[PDB]
Amino acid sequence: DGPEKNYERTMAILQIEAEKAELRLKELEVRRLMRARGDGPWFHYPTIDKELIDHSPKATPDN
Amino acid sequence: SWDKDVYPEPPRRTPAPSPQTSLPNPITYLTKAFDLLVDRPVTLVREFIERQHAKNKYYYYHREFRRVPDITECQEKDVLCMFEAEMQWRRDYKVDQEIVNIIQERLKACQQREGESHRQNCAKELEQFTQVVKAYQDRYHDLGAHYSARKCLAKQKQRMLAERKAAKEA
C-alpha cells in the first residue's frame, strides 16, 4: 500500500475512534444526570398507575 | 554525482614528481600495470553496462510533502489535526537527524583531509557542528522514547519562559 492510502485510512480510523470516545464520555455524564435527577427515560422506576383509581360516586360522600 | 555545496571539498593541490635519484620508482611501473590490467578491463565492462542502461532511461522522483498546520494550531484533542501535525513533526525530526549527520560527515572528512593540520584548518567545520548540535539538542533532547510534537512544544515553551525571565532580570 502506498503512503497516501495508509495515511488517509489512518485518518478515517482516527475519526471513528475519536467519535466513539466522545460518545462514551457523554453517555457517562448523561447517566450520572439521569440517575441523580430522575427526569429521563433511564432509571425511571415505576409508580402506581392512576388509571386503577375508581372515580365513581361512593357509598359515603366524603372521599 | 552529488552536490558539491552540500558535501564540499577544497581544490586539490598535488605536487609534481621531482626525482633526486637515478633508481626507477617501483610505484610508477605498478601504476602503469594497474591501469592496463585493472582499470581498462573494468572500464570496458562498465561502458557496456551503461550502453544497456541508455536504452532504457526511466526516472524516479523525490517525494514532496506539502506543509500542514503545526501542533501549535491544533485544538486540544482534535486528533484529525493533531495526526497530520504529528506526522509532519516526525518527518521533520528524521530530516533534522540527517542534517546533523551531514555536518558530522563534513567534520570527519576535514579531519582526515587536513592531516596533522586539522586542529587549525577544520575550525569552520567544528563551529558549524557545534551550532547544529546545540540547535538539535534544544529541539529534541530529553523528550524520551515516547516523544511527540506535544512534548516537543512543552519543552520549547519551558525554554521560552526561562529566556523571558532571564531577560526581565536584566
Side-chain angles (χ1 to χ4, degrees), chain A residues 3-4 7 10-11 14 18, chain B residues 63 77 79-80 83-84 87:
Chain A
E4 306 95 330
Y7 188 94
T10 299
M11 296 183 84
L14 283 169
Chain B
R63 190 177 270 282
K77 302 181 71 175
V79 302
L80 291 170
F83 167 74
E84 293 180 353
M87 293 300 99

Side-chain angles (χ1 to χ4, degrees), chain B residues 14 28 55 95 99 150:
Chain B
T14 301
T28 301
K55 293 173 213 185
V95 172
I99 286 170
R150 265 178 66 198

Side-chain angles (χ1 to χ4, degrees), chain B residues 85-103:
Chain B
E86 185 63 46
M87 293 300 99
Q88 169 171 265
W89 179 90
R90 276 168 144 78
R91 289 192 299 277
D92 293 0
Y93 187 16
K94 293 183 183 293
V95 172
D96 286 342
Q97 289 160 16
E98 294 307 300
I99 286 170
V100 167
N101 284 323
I102 284 159
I103 300 307

